[PDB]
Ligand binder design. Sequence first.
Ligand SMILES: [Cl-]
Ligand SMILES: [Cl-]
Lengths: 348, 348
Amino acid sequence: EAAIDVCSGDDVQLANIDADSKVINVYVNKGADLSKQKLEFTLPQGATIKVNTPITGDTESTYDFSEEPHSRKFTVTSEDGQWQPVYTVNVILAELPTLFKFEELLTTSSEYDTFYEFTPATSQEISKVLQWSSGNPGFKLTGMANSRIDYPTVQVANGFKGKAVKLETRNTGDFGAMVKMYIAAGNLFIGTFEVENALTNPRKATNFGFQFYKHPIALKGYYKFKAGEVYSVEGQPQTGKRDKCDIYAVMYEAENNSIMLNGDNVFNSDKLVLLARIEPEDIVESDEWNEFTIHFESVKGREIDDTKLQNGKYKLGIVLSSSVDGAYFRGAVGSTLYVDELELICKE
Amino acid sequence: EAAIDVCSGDDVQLANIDADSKVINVYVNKGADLSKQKLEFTLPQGATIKVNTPITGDTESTYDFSEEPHSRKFTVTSEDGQWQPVYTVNVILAELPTLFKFEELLTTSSEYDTFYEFTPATSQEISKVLQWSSGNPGFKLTGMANSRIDYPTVQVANGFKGKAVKLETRNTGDFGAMVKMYIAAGNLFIGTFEVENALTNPRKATNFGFQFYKHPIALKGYYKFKAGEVYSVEGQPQTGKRDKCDIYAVMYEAENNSIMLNGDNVFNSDKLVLLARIEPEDIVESDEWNEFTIHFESVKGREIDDTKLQNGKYKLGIVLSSSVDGAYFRGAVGSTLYVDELELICKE
Ligand SMILES: [Cl-]
Ligand SMILES: [Cl-]
């Protein structure tokens, strides 16, 4: 009859729904406009939802949560018409994490894995939260997967410390071949996946970056990589080249908060300030985990302006991929990159 | 009558003398010319020393240890003339460390502390060794110290993990004032101290850097700092300025292995490639240990050439000081900087 099954939103990294107390805790990245929050509620069929006290700051597509304690009540009325449970929605500010462990999955996402990072706030610092994105919602559309384990991006149990992320380049079948999307690289990235572009503009579907308030120096982690056996270009097998995985991170200037880089301009936009990237020559294929440390280097002499950093003008992105040229459909089905325990080393 | 009490040398980071077996293990930094080793032996009064088998590679002031196992025998004959113990001298290649813990002191240096770092070799890597330098041999000349604890550079027991280094700016007395060397900053650095310049050219006395074969990204550590009460310039008290400590590291190109930077050109030489340095604004005065992380930044767009790095053309230096402008005699007697557990984060 009436309830809130899922809560999403433009700036929502994570939304915890406590069905017992009817409390929804929504974590958003610092910098989000609290006065203009766009939220999306998934309710049972025929049920309606309405904010209890509308306020002037509200618009027809957003809610104003700017006033402390950034908490608003909502009533869900059944189609049935008889049940009207009241939910409290609390918006909580968070920052991107420093450590990424790949231990947690969204319990709402059952068809494929969706990873998130979370560290509770303390007296010293606010909540550290991130919902990682991938190409999984696009891969779903291929009809190729049977369950979560067939996807290009999957959580595995025997990580370096706890669980880890497994990225595997997958075969997209005949239809994939027809639309020239011959392979599906496994990826994990900070930003958003626009599924309405997944097939029409796969590189535009991957948007990278969230507001970051620290100065990054290095990205450190552990990985294992094994290349697939058959390297292909435009769907056809090629000899003489072995596939390689990819790990990189970016810091770029976003004049206004709506600006994001994507798969088509991440390495060519003049907004890019810092870039850390694993050297192809340094990648090994081993059954043992290897530690890597990469350096956030200045792009064309650009540097981080502290005042701009403080005002949220820079966005950080981290991208992991099983096939370095996979976004262009060059790579080998079966290339598998496992990553675990990433650490962002920042100026301190 | 006859023995080897101390063994030193131009390229000798550390020399262990095992009096029981009469074995001297000399660790030198990778890059040293094994065919031209200059060694200095301290023997009892009147005793003489001579290499057992001279070889063609020998010169009148150096020894050739290039041939494996880089081991030569030496006989020490007493003035007494009756005792001739034979010592075996083994030269061992080492690299600069990654971790600096300030736990060990040279047992030969009793008047003032001389710190060294040591990690034994393994199947994976060679010995990691460094003898740290300081201004202590110069301070000795002031007559101001009673024992090791009065020096500007001293090991203290209650470090962050084990023992730590305590750098304290000291008063140089009336003679110091006469020669315009009004204060003595406590320092610790990678390189060499030329005591014959200690008074005549104190900045030239501090030579920085040893051959380093990795790409440094960041220097990380723990510190506590407390400024002295009276800030002075040219021996005279000044109000309106509080003293600050300093921590920095450099990577510079050395065309030939004899090139070193010093106190007069470390921040102006065109050989400088990378510089990491703590921001004055980021230093706090606290009774609690604080972690710092500084970034090796490109100087004037310069970058590390891998082939040159591999051939030992770059030297790394790390410098710690209780008074940032202490080399120019601006600072406060009593400024105290404790450092512990430094870690060099490198590309991997
Ligand atoms: Cl969840
Ligand atoms: Cl010793």
